[PDB]
Amino acid sequence: TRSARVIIASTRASSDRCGPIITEWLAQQGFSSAQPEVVADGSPVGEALRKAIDDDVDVILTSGGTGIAPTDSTPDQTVAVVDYLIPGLAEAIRRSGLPKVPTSVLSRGVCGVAGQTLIVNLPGSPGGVRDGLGVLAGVLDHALDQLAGK
Amino acid sequence: TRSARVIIASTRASSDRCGPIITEWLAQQGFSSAQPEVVADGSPVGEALRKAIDDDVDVILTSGGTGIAPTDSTPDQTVAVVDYLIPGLAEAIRRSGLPKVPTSVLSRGVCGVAGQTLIVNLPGSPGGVRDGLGVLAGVLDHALDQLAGK
Amino acid sequence: TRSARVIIASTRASSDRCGPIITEWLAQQGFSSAQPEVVADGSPVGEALRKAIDDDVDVILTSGGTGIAPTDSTPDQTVAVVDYLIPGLAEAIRRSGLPKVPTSVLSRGVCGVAGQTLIVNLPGSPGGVRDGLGVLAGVLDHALDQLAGK
């Protein structure tokens, strides 16, 4: 397979500029994906993640809900569904926003694996998303290969 | 509010050069703070943290007790009181001591949030404290804004 | 003491080029060590770690089993035996493979302490091992000193 799901975590948007950016990048990179699910912060992120993992896809990309603001629980919902975490990839994604956006260091976004599915939390701004996608460009294919055992 | 508490973790000092550095920086940065609490390693750090969180302040800065030496439990006491952690900020603080102090990578200091209070573990040397405070200079105001929901 | 144990995690090798590299480096650095234990991924890594910790040595270096491939459980076995972790040293080791090996960010290797024993997960390729050993060259002696209380 070479499939992907996109989840946009935003209570504000759910009643979005990042979804089309991610969908285009996935298209550009050769992935098939469904229309992004735009969901409210918190439990709806978890439900969306569960739905996507049950679709049996290769990669799930989330955007939004990763800072320290009251409603930012994307990383916590992501921790609850993964088998394990990839802390170096989450750090690379943070560092991709530096030095130009100092607040990049506040992002709590994680990366991990749920079975055979790689999950990556991106920032909730278009710039951050593009920064994070540049990092994934350099590793994603190798990551999916490694995940599948070559 | 724009309030702060300082905790110096040192059994040696508790029976300190970092406290006045931090108090000055907080003054310089516009925060009101109380005289730093100088406490012994371990449980007294936890108690100090609890006291400060119960004071309802915006930021708690600790210094000391973050290495790998037997009595270094500041990070462990900090993990036990926070609701969540901000691993990118703790990494930024480490990296602020590099390349000049290679042992900066051994620091276990964490950053996190307890309710509406941001907590940041700094190193126990004046140089490390200054290095860490330079990092906070670039983000602290934005972090507190994000924490409060703008 | 100035003692070390080496564990090579590889099901493929266990029925190895990294072991002799590590043994030479330890010799070069003044450590006494035993012949590296080459073990299969998973539970045998845990057993090897337990055996080494029970030998009462100053440092344990592992190689292999740190990526995201199905059988890569070296970090998980290492987490289960340590008293605490040193996340900055594990990050330094990752960053030592960048920018030349972008996939360095996928390594889940950890560093930690079990009692008085420092444990460091290195990558499973000779290049990565050499990259990680360069990092340890700059800090290991100070780390062991700090661990012992000067």
* Beta-carbon separation of C85 and B91 below 8 A: no
* Beta-carbon separation of A105 and B84 below 8 A: no
H or E segment and range at residue B84:
strand B84-85
DSSP sequence for B15-58: ---HHHHHHHHHHHTT-EEPPPEEE-SSHHHHHHHHHHHHTT-S
Q: What are phi and psi of C45, to 5 degrees?
A: -65, -50
| Degrees, nearest 5: CA angle A30-C98-C77 | 90
What Cα–Cα distance (Å) separates residue C17 from each residue in B55, C21, C128?
A: 58, 7, 12
DSSP sequence for C26-94: HHHTT-EEPPPEEE-SSHHHHHHHHHHHHTT-SEEEEES--SSSTT--HHHHHHTT-SEE-HHHHHHHH
Beta strand C59-63 with C3-9 is parallel
Distance between CA atoms of B84 and A61, rounded to whole angstroms? 22
Distance between CA atoms of A97 and A95, rounded to whole angstroms? 5
**Paired strand residues for C63:** C8, C122
Residues closing a segment before a gap in chain B (C–N exceeding 2.5 Å):
15
The alpha carbon dihedral of C27, C29, C31, C36 has a sign of negative
Measured between beta carbons, the chain A residues lying within 8 angstroms of B150 are: 69
Experimental structure resolution, Å: 1.8
Nearest CA among B58, B65, B2, B69 for reference residue B32: B2
* Beta-carbon separation of B139 and A106 below 8 A: yes
Report residue C35 as tokens.
């012949």
Neighbours of A125 (CB within 10 A): 16
Tokens 């960053």 identify what position? C95
DSSP sequence for C15-29: ---HHHHHHHHHHHT
- C partners (3+ CB pairs within 8 A) are A, B
* Beta-carbon separation of B143 and A68 below 8 A: yes
Domains and CATH numbers, chain A: 1-150 (3.40.980.10)
Among A87, A91, A149, beta carbon nearest to C70: A149
* Beta-carbon separation of A108 and B91 below 8 A: no
Among A68, A87, A105, beta carbon nearest to B113: A68
DSSP sequence for A84-95: EE-HHHHHHHHH
* Beta-carbon separation of C143 and B69 below 8 A: no
User: How close does chain C come to A14, measured CA to CA in Å?
Assistant: 32
User: How close does chain A come to B141, measured CA to CA in Å?
Assistant: 10
Distance between CA atoms of A24 and C106, rounded to whole angstroms? 25
Distance of CA A70 to the CA centre of its chain: 20
Experimental determination technique: X-ray
Q: Strand, coil or helix: what is B83?
A: coil
> Could you give the dihedral angle defined by the CA atoms of residues B92, B97, B98 and B104, in that order, rounded to the nearest 10 degrees?
-90
| Degrees, nearest 5: CA angle C21-C24-C29 | 125
Contact C102, C128 (CB under 8 A): no
CB within 8 A of C53, min separation 6: which ones? Answer: C60, C81, C114, C115, C117, C119
Distance between CA atoms of C105 and B41, rounded to whole angstroms? 34
